[PDB]
Design a protein around this ligand. Structure first.
Ligand SMILES: c1ccc2[nH]ncc2c1
Length: 220
């Protein structure tokens, strides 16, 4: 299938990314507390449900939450401020809490079931979010005796995610804190604005995009 792109809500950020985040790819967004990476996740979970003319892919969402950062009320707010129906938008986000790193890996494996079910329907899964990719791995695998296993497990997890992205034409979006992935780094700008910097993209030039966080999620 042709690569599809989901608008981030920000024209500036979309331009930096070559149109939006890609299906058949993992986009990995880094940032510190309050960077906007989870706000971007919430915005994408709304945007993807729109038609292509509006920046979406007529899709469903699956969301794996590792430390309780998913906010249904924020989804409703973004949906309503974008002229959408908040209840319908929420219904098409399948949610799973991951309690630990093993569970998180299992959830990605098992997500394939719902992906298969929705595949040839009116609302195929088009966005799979893991927020965050590494919090459990960082917490569980401490020090050097644990580094080898941590990297091996994380690598396997990313491979599973890549497979779902490629096989089922899904945009995978993961958050992290400091190929395989397209890496975007968020930081605080001036006056409450946020700045995204794209780094080490094989076929997109590095660059920066300034964006805002609003009742619509993110936008220029
Ligand atoms: C949401 C995200 C991942 C999942 N795996 N299984 C069910 C499910 C729901």
């Amino acid at each position: 299938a042709t690569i599809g792109r989901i608008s981030t809500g920000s024209k500036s950020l979309d331009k930096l990314l070559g149109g939006g985040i890609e299906t058949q790819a993992i986009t990995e967004v880094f940032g510190e507390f309050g960077s906007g990476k989870t706000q971007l996740a919430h915005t994408l979970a709304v945007m993807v449900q729109l038609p292509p003319e509006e920046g979406g892919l007529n899709g469903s969402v699956m969301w794996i939450d590792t430390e309780n950062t998913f906010r249904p009320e924020r989804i409703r707010e973004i949906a309503q401020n974008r002229g959408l129906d908040p209840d319908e938008v929420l219904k098409h986000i399948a949610y799973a809490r991951a309690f630990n790193s093993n569970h998180q890996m299992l959830l990605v494996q098992q997500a394939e079931d719902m992906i298969k079910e929705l595949l040839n329907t009116d609302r195929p899964v088009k966005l799979l979010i893991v927020d965050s990719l590494t919090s459990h791995f960082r917490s569980e695998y401490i020090g050097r005796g644990a580094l080898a296993e941590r990297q091996q497990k994380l690598a396997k997890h990313l491979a599973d995610l890549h497979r779902l992205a490629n096989l089922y034409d899904i945009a995978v979006f993961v958050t992290n804190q400091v190929s395989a992935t397209l890496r975007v780094y968020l930081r605080k700008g001036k006056g409450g604005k946020r700045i995204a910097r794209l780094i080490d993209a094989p076929h997109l030039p590095e660059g920066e995009a300034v964006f805002s966080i609003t009742e619509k999620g993110i936008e220029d």
